[PDB]
From Swiss-Prot:
Pathway assigned to this chain's UniProt record: Cofactor metabolism; retinol metabolism; Lipid metabolism; fatty acid metabolism; Steroid metabolism; cholesterol metabolism
Effect of residue 310 to G: In allele CYP2D6*25
Cleaved signal peptide residues: none
Reactions it catalyzes: (5Z,8Z,11Z,14Z)-eicosatetraenoate + reduced [NADPH--hemoprotein reductase] + O2 = (8R,9S)-epoxy-(5Z,11Z,14Z)-eicosatrienoate + oxidized [NADPH--hemoprotein reductase] + H2O + H(+); (5Z,8Z,11Z,14Z)-eicosatetraenoate + reduced [NADPH--hemoprotein reductase] + O2 = (11R,12S)-epoxy-(5Z,8Z,14Z)-eicosatrienoate + oxidized [NADPH--hemoprotein reductase] + H2O + H(+); (5Z,8Z,11Z,14Z)-eicosatetraenoate + reduced [NADPH--hemoprotein reductase] + O2 = (14S,15R)-epoxy-(5Z,8Z,11Z)-eicosatrienoate + oxidized [NADPH--hemoprotein reductase] + H2O + H(+); N-(5Z,8Z,11Z,14Z-eicosatetraenoyl)-ethanolamine + reduced [NADPH--hemoprotein reductase] + O2 = N-(8,9-epoxy-5Z,11Z,14Z-eicosatrienoyl)-ethanolamine + oxidized [NADPH--hemoprotein reductase] + H2O + H(+)
SUPFAM superfamilies documented for this protein: Cytochrome P450 (SSF48264)
Protein's recorded name: Cytochrome P450 2D6
Binding annotation for substrate: 268
Regulation: induction: By pregnancy.
Subcellular localization: Endoplasmic reticulum membrane; Microsome membrane
Keyword Kinase annotated: no
Organism per entry: Homo sapiens
Amino acid sequence: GKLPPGPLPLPGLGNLLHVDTPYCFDQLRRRFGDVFSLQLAWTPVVVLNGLAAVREALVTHGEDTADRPPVPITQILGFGPRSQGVFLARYGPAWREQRRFSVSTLRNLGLGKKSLEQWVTEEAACLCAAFANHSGRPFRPNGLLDKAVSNVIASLTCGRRFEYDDPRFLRLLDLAQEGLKEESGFLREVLNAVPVLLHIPALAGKVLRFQKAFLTQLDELLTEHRMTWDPAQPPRDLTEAFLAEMEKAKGNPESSFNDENLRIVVADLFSAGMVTTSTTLAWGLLLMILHPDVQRRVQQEIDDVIGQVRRPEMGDQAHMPYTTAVIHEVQRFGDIVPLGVTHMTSRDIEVQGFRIPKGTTLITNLSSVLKDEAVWEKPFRFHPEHFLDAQGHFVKPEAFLPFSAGRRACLGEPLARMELFLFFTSLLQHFSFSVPTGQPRPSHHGVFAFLVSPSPYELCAVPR
Ligand code: HEM
Ligand SMILES: Cn1cc([C@H]2C[C@H]3CSC(N)=N[C@@]3(c3ccc(F)cc3F)CO2)cn1
Ligand SMILES: [Zn+2]
Ligand SMILES: [Zn+2]
Ligand SMILES: [Zn+2]
Ligand SMILES: [Zn+2]
């Protein structure tokens, strides 16, 4: 069939100089259509735009697009056939076993005695107190959001939290944010292309220094956890559940439940739901000071449904359509993973008539879905009524895809939904946020990366 169109491919760089990225893709979408091609050096890339193209790839051809592009340099971090974690894992048994394990263990810890909801609610309390200490004084809330969000994951993985001034905790969070920067590095591409370049010890020790440091700090914490683990009792957290599975899997070279995969799985879970959920909440609080009237309606609904003392529960959401709409609109407008996470075709597939060869790198332009002018009333405005009808009922459009879609859709979404609702309501239940008098109106345009964060800003949190 016909291959997707695209700008003229230069000899060596191809379309590398035709892309400086979501803004640039919008122009290409308006010039070549919703499915265009790109030649990024050695890698053949097809960009998918709009709900239909994205759905057709990830749902209709879900079996064939659930794979990841190979990342050879992950060998430095100890990746192997039965140890690929979940996030970057190739489509196959190693991915599926860990995927099913994480999803089911989240659910098991989730239901019963609401361990998840309890850990979040309790961490929300700490976040409130830490906010109270920063009162009467403008302050960036990002650091506190990272910590509270990080503690929720630590609670699920290792069954503990860390104090906000814990030295090892800070180093962990610091190493994690530096590591994220290392993923968007130019040297990553060269070494992924030619794996034998890693046989140079000079280079190998430079590639993922912050990644390796992060995994080292994590190893130390895992070792402590293995000491306190009581195998005579039902697993209290995901790491214990993993360790129990490891015992049963002794003698089985096919199991992905092993030492090498434990640190990778934990690192995937710990980080993927630390910079995403926290950035979303950082967007949330920014949008609340830019739109004080929206903030007041939320706080009003909080009082009408929950009050100003009793801690919020997930059962309250069903009776809080407006707050729910606001949170959704934060994710939509926030648009924090505009190009999602790359997929790869494991077979020859067909998208929007065009042909996609096997082994093609797929980019899901999630931004083009969340900001679709054909779907949303005013997609470039912060507008909670994107999820409300005239009667005030919450409505969720098909195009709400911040967690992507299909087999590889965010496994942490249920937890994320929980963290977002409980942290947001709890903060707005006890605080009123506003721009600091004397300071310029903070921009609503984010700083582009693999993850789009709000521009740096300060705020005032006055108690209620
Ligand atoms: C606002 C919060 C979050 C957003 C917007 C978000 C978004 C995403 C996106 C776009 C993907 C890519 C899906 C794809 O490859 O097509 C993804 C995958 C993933 N997310 Fe999240 N995420 C969030 C929070 C979390 C949390 C809390 C966790 C874990 C506790 C988590 C863990 C993961 C993992 C492990 C994957 C890989 C799944 C797989 O490859 O099978 N994320 N997420
Ligand atoms: C959805 N989404 C998750 C992300 C996260 C996922 C994590 C874990 S797995 C990975 N490959 N990179 C991340 C990551 C990797 C190493 C590290 F030291 C810190 C990290 F945050 C960055 O992107 C960004 N968007
Ligand atoms: Zn831990
Ligand atoms: Zn434990
Ligand atoms: Zn209605
Ligand atoms: Zn209060």
